[PDB]
Each structure stands twice: as structure tokens, then as C-alpha cells.
């Protein structure tokens, strides 16, 4: 599949901009609650994505009635 | 005047779970202003996201051959 | 707020290529019905916008290491 | 590249209203075009959200008047 050095390798291809996470991964359960971390991250971060955009129309939408 | 009910009321319509935007709009300099920081987490916020799952698909695999 | 002509130039102005709404808007019940239709294709696209997203992410992973 | 298996439990994981798509693989341009088909769609709907996000402004501020 991938060990850590070609997974942080297709990090920095995939994000240029970011540094690889370095997670502990010592055992299967460490696997599954970084997976879990991961899961309830990517729950938080679609809400704030949405919210956000929300914003932006609304913002857009005001400087037009105001353009 | 320039009064929010309907973004108000919107904003607690999808996520009744966050703080109401406290935004300086009083000016189109700051609305402006706003819509750029709006932009600039959308953009973060939304490349955080994908690092996230990526970091779950690289997990999720990591952990089918160890199971 | 705003009526009619701005909401038509808003739209316009975010959104050049579609046309604005048609919407039959006559009294209360009309704009419920509406807002419920809206919040319900608001939630049924961000979830393809989700899936859609962690396709395209998947797909360009494979295309790192492969 | 981190590969299946766990691909699918990411997608049954993150979403559960779908079934994963069976995507065709079986080379490089395979991917492509899927990924090709993928930021269409993500263009598409993010223009189709912010559509309705829109009118749900107007909506909202129509309806909090006359009800």
C-alpha cells in the first residue's frame, strides 16, 4: 500500500503546503481511534466549510445591493 | 435599515450549534473586507478537509491489512 | 431589504450564466413550501459535494505513489 | 497509495446514505477521467448550493415580514 515515508511523501504532493501529521501508530487500536479523530475532524470541518460559504453568499449578495 | 433577520434566523435554520456572525458590516469597505476572510477560511478550511481524508483513506487501509 | 429588481441584479451578479427563479411567491404558505424545498436540496447537494469531494481525493491519492 | 477495502469503509464511514461507487480502474486514464468527472461535479453542485443558499436568503427575509 504505502509505509509513513511514501504517505507523507504523497502528502506533500497532494498539500504542498501542509506538514505530514505524525501519528503514533504502534498498534491497531491506535489506528482506530486516529480514525475516529479523523472521522469526527472531518464532521466539524464540513459544518464550518458550510457556514462559511453561507457567509459568502450573503456577503456577496450585499455589496451587490450596495454596488 | 441594513438589518439581518432572515441571514439571523437562516444561520440558526442550519447550524444551531454556533455563534451568530458578528461582522463589522457597516461600510462596503467592510463588508468587502468580510467577504475576503470569509473566502480565505472557506479556501483552509476546505484543503483541511481533504488532508483529513486522506489521512482516513491511508488509515483505512493501514488498517485492513492489520485486522 | 430588498424587492424584485436588486434581487434579480444580485442573483445576476453572483450567478451570470443561470437565470433567476421564477418563483410563484402569493402568500405565506408559498414561501414555507419554497424554504422547505430549498433547505432540503441545500442538504441533498452538500452531501454530494462531500462524496464528490472524497472521490476526487481518492482518486489523485492513487495518483502519488502509483 | 493506499488503496480498496479501504476506500469503501472510508465511504461507508463518512457516508451512509450511499453505496460506493464501483468506479472503473484499470489505468492511468481510467483515473483520470473519473477525477476529470469528480471537479465537474464538485463545480457544478457548489454552484447549485450556493444557488438555493441564496434563495433561502431571500426566502427567509420574505417570509419574516408577511408571517
Redesign the interface.
Known amino acids: 500500500?504505502?509505509d509513513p515515508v511514501?504517505?507523507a511523501?504523497?502528502?506533500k504532493?497532494?498539500?504542498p503546503?501542509?506538514e505530514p501529521?505524525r501519528m503514533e501508530?504502534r498498534s491497531?487500536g491506535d489506528?482506530?481511534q486516529?480514525?475516529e479523530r479523523?472521522?469526527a475532524?472531518?464532521r466539524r470541518?464540513?459544518?464550518?466549510?458550510?457556514?462559511?460559504?453561507?457567509?459568502?453568499?450573503?456577503?456577496?449578495?450585499?455589496?451587490?445591493?450596495?454596488?
Chains 1, 2, 4 share one sequence.
Request: aromatic content about 10%; overall charge negative.
Open positions: 500500500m504505502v511514501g504517505f511523501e504523497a502528502w504532493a497532494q498539500f503546503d501542509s501529521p501508530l491497531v489506528i482506530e486516529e480514525l479523523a472521522k475532524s472531518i470541518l464540513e459544518q464550518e466549510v458550510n457556514q462559511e460559504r453561507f457567509r459568502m453568499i450573503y456577503l456577496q449578495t450585499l455589496l451587490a445591493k450596495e454596488k
